[PDB]
Design a protein around this ligand. Structure first.
Ligand SMILES: OC[C@@H]1O[C@H](O)[C@H](O)[C@H](O)[C@@H]1O[C@@H]1O[C@H](CO)[C@@H](O[C@@H]2O[C@H](CO)[C@@H](O)[C@H](O)[C@H]2O)[C@H](O)[C@H]1O
Ligand SMILES: OC[C@H]1O[C@@H](O[C@H]2[C@H](O)[C@@H](O)[C@H](O[C@H]3[C@H](O)[C@@H](O)[C@@H](O)O[C@@H]3CO)O[C@@H]2CO)[C@H](O)[C@@H](O)[C@@H]1O
Ligand SMILES: [Cl-]
Ligand SMILES: [Cl-]
Ligand SMILES: [Cl-]
Ligand code: NA
Ligand code: NA
Lengths: 417, 417
């Protein structure tokens, strides 16, 4: 008797780590859990195709921002019973509890698996040589720009590369992170990705404060703090650039702390200079508030599964205290189950404590039926904003026109695919 | 106790597991554990160059054929003339494959051929039949190719699973090395080239009249609405996933997709999908100056800082030899690099693969130059910006020329470095 699970690359050896996580469940129940790893860039295509075709795994990993969109298609088995078995609404942060369902829905369609939120990694060696105080650089937008300017002027060279470091690396194309990396600047300026306007969600990417935030962020590339090359790269490539010692600063989740402690052979970067000179700081406060992206992933059961009782036992296992701590140790993500955040393993990790204590500023998108389509279009149009910088064509007016077109396309996507 | 570390790219549906099965017989004969690390193609250049500059990495790495010169020129690869001699020397290989064993003009081979691949068009047999397109006409010539795309665009055919129309052609517009490899046959078919020898040096020819004429024809297919806007922000993996999901009638790929079509989703294929039961292959059409396709593959290279060179060379002889050659080509859907391994029935009896074997007559490679990794990164970056001109409605002959002038200045720095 057999289960199929789809996962995304959450750990350095994703399939191997997942098989080690579930080995105790397989021995307790005498069942094989098969796992298939889907890269984040293809995960939306494969999960939507399973949903429309009626053919797929028993369980899939679902990014928190996609839970509503797949739930709206009527293909997910309700999992209120599993959530109750794990201690109900009180066993979770309210933010995590909202990701268990499409907004407004009666029944939970996803079990919280892990949480993640964004902050700035920085080269402790690079900022000290530039004379940049991290606490000041990451406190405000003025501090953040002032720090990048000192990093740009610095004569510091990576000991291994013997070359200067880009002050800031950020992916300009492909990745969902093109949206998640823009969102804190939009939010900090008092903007948002979407707003409710008389019963209906619509794009707010072209609101005055959304344009102010987005323009500040884009203007960092325009000022030469982000290298032109970075504007054509995706998250994986920017990550690799940081590990290789080529960027002083970059935004990521808590998984990089875990990657920093594991050799290249096992998918980490423990051998690199960047791993030995690693700091973390939260997103700076904008003029209207202080925000970072908060998300993570849940687990969802397809209602066409031929193994629903067994699949629910797997959900209860993976969502429960033991598996929560073990998978968070293997991945460097945060447990989704509130109680596991206290575990000593997490408490005593200095860089991880910075992530945990930055949760205070965590914000996520509303859980809407349109949302996978919104992320695809957002990533495409923000990709074109980064192009305006690459081309030396970034003005207030060209960004406004571009986000008007993004907003028209997003409004379509909130209505239908 | 004896250990080897090997870096590979994702050549097969379950890359690490397939490689471990490939090397099991070697591990049992020699009492050695081979550890494999899988590097996505998008980060492979950064990781391999960082291993080269730092002097820390694996014993063996997979190297794309087009990178063998570039890593060799960094002084970091072990000569492997002894291994190539043991596998039968120059006569055991196609001349095009033998040129990928070394930096142009080098006395010593620095890589062992592992597998070969070349590009052709997959097409939906059902979509072309419904549109009234004769594949022999569509894939004969540039005019026939555009005429076929026009019928596909007009067709009222809908995918049985998606219930939606198919884009006539999908092609990746960003990130992937394939952005270059996909443009090369149009450049070559117009009588252009990526580089040329002038003043006793290699330089960009991407801004020659014929190179611009082939690139312009290619980009004009998106301008004419035969390629969806969405595709122009996607990488290879996402375009492949779109084809498997039933969203594209035509796309350019290698022979590995034949293998993926025969394996369920759970094992990394698409056997469940309509496209898998409606799969045709046709060669690149002849351009005005003749018929060309991209011919590449991957070789295996030994870092000259390896602590295990005798044992690593025994693994190279194994992986390069007749048994392992057929086995890995069966598991990946590539072609063996060793000419003699082409006789196996897995290749000779495969009717879609016959189309690739026949396309090898028109196969063309890039010169094995110092600096080629830089050329590909810069080509992909600038060709990414050419696809952006289409997305922005700014594609003109003079805008393409100005952009390829910028590409050519950047490329010439990389070839001189
Ligand atoms: O994401 C990997 C892709 O997924 C498919 O299902 C297959 O696994 C396949 O490997 C595919 O990626 C493309 O694979 C080809 C062949 O390995 C790559 O082509 C090589 O590119 C190198 C770098 O430019 C060249 O040196 C070499 O000659 C080519 O064979 C291509 O880059 C992948 O995107
Ligand atoms: O928007 C979809 C989904 O995104 C989730 O974040 C993902 C990012 O999309 C992804 O790019 C990032 O990828 C890294 C991976 O987890 C690590 O193993 C790393 O080493 O490799 C990848 C980068 O190359 O992961 C995050 C976290 O899973 C959001 O969490 C989610 O809310 C949202 O729905
Ligand atoms: Cl929002
Ligand atoms: Cl694997
Ligand atoms: Cl060429
Ligand atoms: Na693995
Ligand atoms: Na699919």
């Amino acid at each position: 008797k057999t289960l199929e699970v789809w996962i995304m690359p959450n750990s350095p050896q994703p399939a191997e780590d997942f098989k080690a996580l579930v080995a105790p469940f397989e021995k307790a129940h005498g069942v094989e859990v098969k796992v298939t790893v889907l890269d984040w860039g293809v995960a939306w295509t494969k999960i939507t195709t399973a949903a429309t075709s009626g053919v797929g795994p028993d369980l899939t990993q679902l990014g928190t921002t996609w839970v509503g969109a797949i739930s709206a298609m009527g293909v997910l088995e309700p999992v209120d019973d599993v959530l109750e078995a794990l201690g109900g609404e009180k066993a979770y942060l309210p933010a995590v509890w909202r990701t268990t369902r499409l907004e407004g829905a009666r029944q939970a369609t996803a079990v919280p698996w892990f949480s993640e939120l964004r902050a700035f990694y920085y080269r402790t060696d690079a900022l000290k040589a530039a004379g940049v105080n991290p606490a000041e650089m990451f406190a405000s937008w003025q501090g953040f720009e002032a720090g990048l300017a000192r990093l740009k002027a610095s004569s510091f060279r990576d000991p291994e590369t013997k070359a200067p470091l880009a002050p800031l690396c950020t992916p300009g194309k492909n990745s969902w992170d093109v949206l998640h990396n823009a969102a804190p600047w939009i939010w900090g300026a008092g903007g948002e990705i979407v707003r409710q306007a008389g019963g209906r969600w619509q794009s707010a990417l072209n609101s005055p404060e959304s344009l102010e935030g987005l323009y500040f962020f884009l203007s960092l590339a325009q000022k030469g703090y982000v290298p032109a090359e970075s504007l054509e790269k995706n998250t994986a490539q920017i990550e690799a650039d940081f590990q290789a010692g080529k960027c002083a600063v970059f935004a990521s989740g808590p998984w990089m702390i875990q990657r920093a402690q594991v050799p290249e052979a096992k998918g980490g970067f423990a051998e690199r200079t960047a791993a030995k000179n690693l700091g973390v700081a939260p997103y700076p406060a904008g003029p209207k508030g202080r925000y970072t992206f908060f998300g993570g992933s849940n687990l969802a059961l397809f209602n066409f599964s031929k193994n629903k009782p067994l699949a629910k036992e797997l959900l209860k296992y993976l969502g429960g205290p033991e598996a929560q701590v073990r998978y968070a140790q293997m991945t460097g993500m945060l447990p989704a189950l509130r109680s596991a955040w206290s575990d000593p393993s997490f408490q005593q990790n200095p860089l991880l404590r910075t992530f945990i204590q930055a949760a205070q500023f965590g914000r996520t998108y509303p859980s809407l039926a349109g949302w996978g389509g919104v992320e695809n279009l957002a990533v495409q149009h923000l990709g074109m904003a980064w192009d305006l910088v690459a081309q030396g064509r970034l003005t207030r007016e060209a960004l406004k026109d571009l986000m008007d077109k993004a907003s028209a396309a997003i409004n379509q996507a909130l209505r239908h695919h």
